[PDB]
């Protein structure tokens, strides 16, 4: 009984050392740099082939192909420049809350209530997209799949366990068990050895690939965290919560830097992305619009209002050309 | 026109055509969310129909294609994956009437099921009551009083009166009476008519505001 008291005491010591080593008062620091100004994204292309609600999209590293996941049981690889459907992929489970697209462009991963992250081979002989590896071993719904490599996929799930996998064998290289609530998001680092995760227990945990243990755990949100994403430097990330706030967490400082909230916004965040320079933070709400956020000012500076339902998925290209947001409006739209 | 090996566009239109065909074929069908809680007779009803995570069961009745989303395998938070299931025609719902003690970890099959039935996305929750006794529920309500789980009950302890009180409590769970209709059915044997009952409930669902773009509802 007393050891639990000592553990709570060390938790209090950790949070007191978090507060004590910080005297920045970041509201003073933030105002120094110039504002970015009203950034009028305009819907350049509208991608009209989904007959149902869509939950995830992922971009390519060539910044021209984007995969799109939808509840009618379809993945679409979507030539973004010309609005051509390359590779409509028929799923086995129509309940897919996540989607991934390999940096090599050879593979797509998606999963959901089927508790399986299926891996699909895009570039193959015999023509059509085949399913390569069904990754079984989770028991909850799969909320996020992300490729580290053509043979390393990191998945997070609603059984409170993130797992890293070897696609060739099909078994978990690592499991990441430190979350108590259902895990709702992931983000791979730019250097691809760290990855951060967000869960329903309002705690965001950094992880390692080889170590397999949570180095750090970030709190501050009061509800589920629905979407998480690294800053492109890799030394920070931002979380999207049902709290109706977005928080910018730095790995190395170990405190929340800025909160992205306004008084008018009430609904929950659903997807988060960053610009290539990292000056502007995408954020996609249930208010039917992607209010896009200056990362440094913590000020809204533009609205990607084009959707007739809640916007579920957001993605910025790797070169920074585009932002493609899909929604239960059933249409993905690249703004620019 | 600047289209040279843009038979990519022809392939994209062909994919659009196949998508429209599949989407129309999918929206022609009926989606039911089997939301009955644990230790009920959801297994019993799915064996009564013709028939690792979500378990989707499909069946045919009177030229109408059904799909049943038995989601009992998920132990996650129900808040996160239930908004996926909006737009279902009806929610099948099992309740085990007996529990042999609710005829609160013991008397689960009344108060926990009562606690389950809360509503945030609105549709006709076709609640099926399942005795789990053939006719034996008569002798097990003779043996133990039903006032154990329901303190305010003072009606007759026979079959029909107690069953009607349980039904009345389950409808009293509902808040918005005019929006949703809770189609209630108590049957354990069910040689037929549980197929007919879900058929009639989803028929009244697809009539109302699903085939009332015309006819103005």
């Amino acid at each position, epitope marked *: 009984d007393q050891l639990r008291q000592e553990a709570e005491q060390l938790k209090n010591q950790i949070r007191d050392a978090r507060k004590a080593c910080a005297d920045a008062t970041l509201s003073q620091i933030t105002n120094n740099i110039d504002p970015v100004g009203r950034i009028q994204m305009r819907t350049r292309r509208t991608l009209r082939g989904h007959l149902a609600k869509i939950y995830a999209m992922h971009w390519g590293t060539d910044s021209r192909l984007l995969v799109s996941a939808s509840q009618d049981g379809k993945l679409i690889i979507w030539d973004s420049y010309t609005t051509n459907k*390359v590779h409509a992929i028929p799923l086995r489970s129509s309940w897919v809350m996540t989607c991934a697209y390999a940096p090599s462009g050879n593979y797509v991963a998606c999963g959901g209530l089927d508790n399986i992250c299926s891996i699909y081979n895009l570039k193959t*002989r015999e023509g059509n997209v085949r399913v390569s590896r069904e990754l079984a071993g989770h028991t909850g719904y799969l909320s996020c799949c992300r490729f580290l490599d053509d043979n390393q996929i990191v998945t997070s799930s609603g059984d409170t366990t993130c797992a890293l996998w070897d696609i060739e064998t099909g078994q978990q290289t690592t499991t990441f068990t430190g979350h108590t609530g259902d895990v709702m998001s992931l983000s791979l680092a730019p250097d691809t050895r760290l990855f951060v995760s967000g869960a329903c227990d309002a705690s965001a945990k950094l992880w390692d690939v080889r170590e397999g243990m949570c180095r750090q755990t970030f709190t501050g949100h009061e509800s589920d965290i629905n979407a998480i994403c690294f800053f492109p430097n890799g030394n920070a990330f931002a979380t999207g919560s049902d709290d109706a706030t977005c928080r910018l967490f730095d790995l190395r400082a170990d405190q929340e830097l800025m909160t992205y909230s306004h008084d008018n916004i009430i609904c929950g965040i659903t997807s988060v992305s960053f610009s290539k320079s990292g000056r502007l933070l995408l954020a996609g709400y249930d208010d039917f619009n992607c209010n896009v956020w200056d990362a440094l000012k913590a000020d809204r500076a533009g609205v990607l209002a084009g959707h007739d339902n809640r916007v579920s998925c957001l993605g910025v290209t790797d070169d920074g050309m585009a932002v493609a947001t899909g929604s239960w409006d059933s249409f993905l739209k690249i703004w620019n | 026109l600047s289209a040279e*090996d843009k038979a*990519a566009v022809e392939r994209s239109k062909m994919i659009d055509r196949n998508l429209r065909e599949d989407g129309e074929k999918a929206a022609r069908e009926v989606k039911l969310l089997l939301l009955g809680a644990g230790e009920s007779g959801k297994s019993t009803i799915v064996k009564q129909m013709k028939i690792t995570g979500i378990v989707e069961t499909h069946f045919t009745f009177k030229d109408l294609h059904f799909k049943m989303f038995d989601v009992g395998g998920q132990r996650s938070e129900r808040k996160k994956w239930i908004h996926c299931f909006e737009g279902v025609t009806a929610i099948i719902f099992c309740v085990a009437l007996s529990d042999y003690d609710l005829v609160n970890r013991m008397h689960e099959s009344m108060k926990l099921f009562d606690s389950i039935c809360n509503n945030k996305w609105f549709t006709d929750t076709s609640i099926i009551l399942f005795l789990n006794k053939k006719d034996l529920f008569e002798e097990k309500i003779k043996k133990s009083p039903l006032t154990i789980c329901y303190p305010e009950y003072a009606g007759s302890n026979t079959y029909e009166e107690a069953a009607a009180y349980i039904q009345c409590q389950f409808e009293d769970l509902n808040k918005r009476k005019d929006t949703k209709e809770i189609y209630t059915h108590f049957t354990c044997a069910t040689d037929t008519k549980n197929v007919q009952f879900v058929f009639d409930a989803v028929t009244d669902v697809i009539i109302k505001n699903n085939l009332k773009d015309c006819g103005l509802f």
Partner: single-chain antibody
Framework: VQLVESGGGLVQPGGSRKLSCSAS????????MHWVRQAPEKGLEWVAY????????YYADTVKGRFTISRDDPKNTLFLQMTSLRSEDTAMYYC??????????????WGQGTTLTVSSSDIVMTQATSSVPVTPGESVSISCRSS???????????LYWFLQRPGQSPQLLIY???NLASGVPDRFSGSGSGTAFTLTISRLEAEDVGVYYC?????????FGAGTKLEL
């Protein structure tokens, strides 16, 4: 992937014949089919092109309206129907997979080719030379020139490169003037400009002996160079 085709033989001039091509191993419903012919002493030249599921059909202007193409998509069988064959149709005919989307590699897989003998404004491709003498390990460059520049507004220079081994089928080496095909070694490369094209094979080895062919895909017809044959 295995494209086997039949229909070759000797036919009287003015007679009719239907070539067939039995695709066996791929999503033949999802592939554009071509046809390319080759006279026994001459180079390749295009014949026809049916799109994925007959959405768009072209023909060669030398045989426009006299040849007919037809795909049996559920049967997975490609036909070419020919009527009243002339003396210019002593040639051997190849089935050609192609598939078009962003990143795709058309003209990659070629059939075994069937031989057909009869009894008895557009782009032009210019070869560099008839032949180059060969020694293994020594780098050599093979060039073609075109009438019109091939670099479209896409940035996509529609230059292809091939190789028909002595007594074998062709294959694809460099598609769209820079990009390497799959199943071929990485020694090959392609450097191109507006109409100025070079195949920069380095570390020449055995089994690279044969005749190279260059093709344009900017517009129809598809025209082939004579190319070079690397032999001492």
């Amino acid at each position: 992937v295995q494209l086997v085709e039949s229909g070759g033989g000797l036919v009287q001039p003015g007679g009719s014949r239907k070539l067939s091509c039995s695709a066996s191993g791929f999503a033949f419903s999802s592939f554009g089919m071509h046809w390319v012919r080759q006279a026994p002493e001459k180079g390749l030249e295009w014949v026809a092109y049916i799109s994925s599921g007959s959405g768009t059909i072209y023909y060669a202007d030398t045989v426009k309206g006299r040849f007919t193409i037809s795909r049996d998509d559920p049967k997975n069988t490609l036909f070419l129907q020919m009527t009243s064959l002339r003396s210019e149709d002593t040639a051997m005919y190849y089935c050609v997979r192609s598939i078009y989307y962003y990143g795709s590699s058309p003209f990659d897989f070629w059939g075994q080719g069937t031989t057909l003998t009869v009894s008895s404004s557009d782009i032009v491709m210019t070869q560099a030379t008839s032949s180059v003498p060969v020694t293994p390990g020594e780098s050599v460059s093979i060039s073609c020139r075109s009438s019109k520049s091939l670099l479209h507004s896409n940035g996509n220079t529609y230059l292809y490169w091939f190789l028909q081994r002595p007594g074998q089928s062709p294959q694809l080496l460099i598609y769209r003037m820079s990009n390497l095909a799959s199943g071929v070694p990485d020694r090959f490369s392609g450097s191109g400009s507006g109409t100025a094209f070079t195949l920069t094979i380095s570390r020449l080895e055995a089994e690279d002996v044969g005749v190279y062919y260059c093709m344009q895909h900017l517009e129809y017809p598809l025209t082939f160079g004579a190319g070079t044959k690397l032999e001492l």
